[PDB]
Amino acid sequence: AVQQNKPTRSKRGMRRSHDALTAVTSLSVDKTSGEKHLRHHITADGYYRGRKVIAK
Amino acid sequence: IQEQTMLNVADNSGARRVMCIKVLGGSHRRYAGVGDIIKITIKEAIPRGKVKKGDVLKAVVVRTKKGVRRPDGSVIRFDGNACVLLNNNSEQPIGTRIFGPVTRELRSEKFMKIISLAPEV
Amino acid sequence: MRHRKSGRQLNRNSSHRQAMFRNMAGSLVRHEIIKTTLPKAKELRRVVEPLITLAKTDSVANRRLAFARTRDNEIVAKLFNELGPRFASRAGGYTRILKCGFRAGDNAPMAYIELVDRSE
RNA sequence: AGGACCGAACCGACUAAUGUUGAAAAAUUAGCGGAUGACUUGUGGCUGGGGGUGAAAGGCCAAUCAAACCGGGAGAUAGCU
RNA sequence: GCUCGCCGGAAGACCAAGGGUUCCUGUCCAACGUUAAUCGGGGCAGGGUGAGUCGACCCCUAAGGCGAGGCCGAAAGGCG
RNA sequence: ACACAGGUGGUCAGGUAGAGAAUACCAAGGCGCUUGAGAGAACUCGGGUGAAGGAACUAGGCAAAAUGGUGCCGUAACUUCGGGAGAAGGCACGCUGAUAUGUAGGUGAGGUCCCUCGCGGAUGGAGCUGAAAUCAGUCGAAGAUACCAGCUGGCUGCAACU
RNA sequence: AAUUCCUUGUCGGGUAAGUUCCGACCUGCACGAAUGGCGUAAUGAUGGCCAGGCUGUCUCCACCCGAGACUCAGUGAAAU
RNA sequence: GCUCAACGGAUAAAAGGUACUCCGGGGAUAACAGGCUGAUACCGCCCAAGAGUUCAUAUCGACGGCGGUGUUUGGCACCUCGAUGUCGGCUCAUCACAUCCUGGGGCUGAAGUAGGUCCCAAGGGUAUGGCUGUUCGCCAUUUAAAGUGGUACGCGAGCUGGGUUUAGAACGUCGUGAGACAGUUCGGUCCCUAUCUGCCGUGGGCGCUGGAGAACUGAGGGGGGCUGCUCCUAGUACGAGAGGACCGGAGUGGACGCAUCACUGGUGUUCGGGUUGUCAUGCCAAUGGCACUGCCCGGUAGCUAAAUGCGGAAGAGAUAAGUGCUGAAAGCAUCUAAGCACGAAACUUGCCCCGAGAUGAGUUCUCCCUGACCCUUUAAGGGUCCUGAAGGAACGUUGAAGACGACGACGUUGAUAGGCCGGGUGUGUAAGCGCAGCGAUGCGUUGAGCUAACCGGUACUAAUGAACCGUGAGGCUUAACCU
């Protein structure tokens, strides 16, 4: 249940080795407005692929 | 059928309600109900029957609510659980006349007499 | 396990799921474009699109069925008068889902579900 | 008429499960007992520590009881750690 | 704003205790709120509580308390 | 100690079903309980339903399952004559129509008569309300249809009992 | 026997099988008449046993429905 | 002048209970467990008086003897009293062999059947109930058998608390009494969110020497090893009869394990219907909410078992107790010494699963990259520009894969999901209208209407073109081969 000896900062780092965030690595650029968006996502001005899908 | 199972009696000499104290045949056999032989106590008996209350002797299950499965997939289910009383040493029918339906699964060895006496097979 | 099974529980009971899908389908018929989380939109397709396939045929029993589902007579009237002729030649896919940005309160994958031939 | 009967409020606490770093320093959820009386509850008051009170259990006397709590003797004493 | 669900001998409404400004309006979101907060019982100002009839006060007692004198007790004090 | 699943005296008490302040659904009125979004492993908690057997489980029927309401039959051993006794066992329950354009019963406007002639009485006798029963029909597998609502009997120890 | 060590005494009974139970016998280690003796209808959230109904208690587990557990965002302890 | 006799004399003068207990210490000192020992206990061997008709050893073994195990009662007090939970049951095991069954043998006072005793052998298997808290034990009925021991008398950070083992109460006995019992009876709180090792599953990084995609070899490791009954041989052998083959065959089961859902069912809160009470959509009708899914009645997919298929083998190698052949030592003799042949569920293979992180990192097939410059502290390097290959990764639609990663299918050269069309299934003749009926209701339209997770089709909706990672011919020494 409880630890019997205190874990080291080395063991803390080895456990946290996989708690490293993943970057997006690719941001899609829309044709009719060259603003960047998440791929398969709207452009935050309202465009998907070449068309203004949402007015807001 | 199982242990602590009450059964009706098909044959006349066997009397009324009987209970399965042991499922004979097998080391840890739990459930046996088609042509199997089970050790039987007589929990309640009429005096016209030859056997009496508190007596242990064998029986063979003839009717089961679970029912037999035929080779083509047919399931004959008989309402009620029934047994034909048999002697402990001989495993031969005590009752002279068998009552109710019987199955063709009871066609082996001493059960030929049971299907011979019983009307509907 | 979940093998060849359909429907999303969405962490609610069946009465709440039916109530949300009725209210949601009414909102989609009224506004024709709504913002909802992406799993809820995917399950919304299966409740809105049968109503339009009902509404392609206009009869008293069909109006009663589309009232028994969604329990809103204005949604029934819109489904049978305005939509239906809007989607009569169309063979399915009346609702279209566009994934949008994550919700600020909790990181939920969000989307916009809309009727396909919306004017604007 | 009934320290009568079934049963809500109300009073209590028989069994079980959960909780047991709890939602809670004894509760929750199903069932349980009593429920016109030796019943219950509000507001005041009275009884004070080798004393009170007790349909009695070493029970209760402010989450404390085989002699409450607070200050003083007091830096008691400790052949023990 | 439109639907949905819950309580409805209450999770509705009012007196008493108890709290003491938590009520209302405006502004802000550092800290508190087991999250975000534009919101708040949070911060900061400013308002608001109007009685011959409602309570208190008051007049009168109960259990009981105090109790001039008095009886008693080493003193404190006990009883009346 | 907390924006704590606890504790906290009194007042009011709508409709329908119902004996009811139970319970169910709702009025008036107030709330969704100050973290959410997904997936739908084990395992845990709270439930529903299970072939055949049925207490073989277990320290023990612990727990679940079961019975449950009204009316009417009936109903013991012992007894302290009260009991035991809802003993046990059971049957009828829905809707429609007729009896009866809604009956038994309740309540009582007019008219009339009498009188202390007015908050008077008398066959006052229209409306309103109205339960139960009998007969016949009719639906379902099922009519206490939900919530609610008892498991029953026998032998013994102890304590009379509340 | 709420008491009997030996002891699971012995007879009758209940179960296929009964160190439990009931009626007892009397060989009472070590009952006994207000420290009451013995019976007793009713009553008991009392002790022991049997039976019927009933069933996931069990054979022997299976599916489904919700709250956790798993993943993502925010806040973020503990004993040791 | 002292039985100050506890005699170096606490004072003239002093008994007990504590389970209501509290405090300071101790493993200086008992209870559990471990540890030493093994008297006792269990097992084995030695001598053989004898019982066995005679015959010590078929089987038992007198009086005595010698060991082995740690295995019961003990001995000790080494360890923990600044805490190692107590029997039993449940769940899950694992080992030894002093073997209960099954396997192989020897002797038999072994005719057969069935036995006794001893040797080899641990692969697998090795009951359910009545009683009681019970391990036990006794009993009922099975079975091939219902093994004996170790594992903190296995297992309470896994479960239980029936028992001893607190606090309430009573009975019997003891004591004047408080109370006590190596007696009885009733009741009596069982905490933990897993750091490390360990296991069970599933992944990231890097390595394996250019980088990829696949198929493998198998070094190792794991699983699985049970057995009954009926018949044929055969009423044969054997036998005074009664009875009756423990070779070789075939079928059918019990238990166990794996897979699957075609059947038989179970569930199926996401399908259909009945129906109680109430509320609502104005109302009639039709519906929806709520009451455990309100209560039910059926039920598709999926999962499942009780349903269905299959398997534990045959064979080969080397063996164990045992049985031998040839054969000297020791002219005979002898299973062994030289040789040689048999021989079991044990061992190694054979069957099934993982498996090259097998750092000993293996093999085979295929794919893809062959441009310059600058500096340099040159087995070697660093940088710049151009170039990004096969492929992976990401993103999206998703799955009979899944906790998450992972794995698989698809991405407009598209059937990957939802929708749509048709069918199947399931429920049971919808709404509305008409007719009959005083009405409830019935009849027709109508096996109607709804219908899921299923089957077959269909781009209607979403799977955008990019972008990212990965590069630009791969070290140094030595051999057949050619300059």
Side-chain angles (χ1 to χ4, degrees), chain A residues 21-49:
Chain A
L21 282 187
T22 51
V24 279
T25 73
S26 166
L27 267 173
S28 42
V29 157
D30 192 359
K31 328 174 311 175
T32 195
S33 58
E35 79 206 277
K36 312 216 169 358
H37 56 111
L38 261 183
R39 186 158 187 94
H40 295 100
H41 286 73
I42 315 299
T43 45
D45 212 44
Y47 300 88
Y48 200 159
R49 281 164 68 152

Side-chain angles (χ1 to χ4, degrees), chain C residues 97-111:
Chain C
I97 45 166
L98 288 53
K99 305 150 250 281
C100 80
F102 287 92
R103 175 150 88 181
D106 65 276
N107 218 54
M110 287 271 145

Side-chain angles (χ1 to χ4, degrees), chain C residues 89-101:
Chain C
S89 62
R90 202 168 214 99
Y94 321 115
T95 71
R96 158 199 300 143
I97 45 166
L98 288 53
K99 305 150 250 281
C100 80

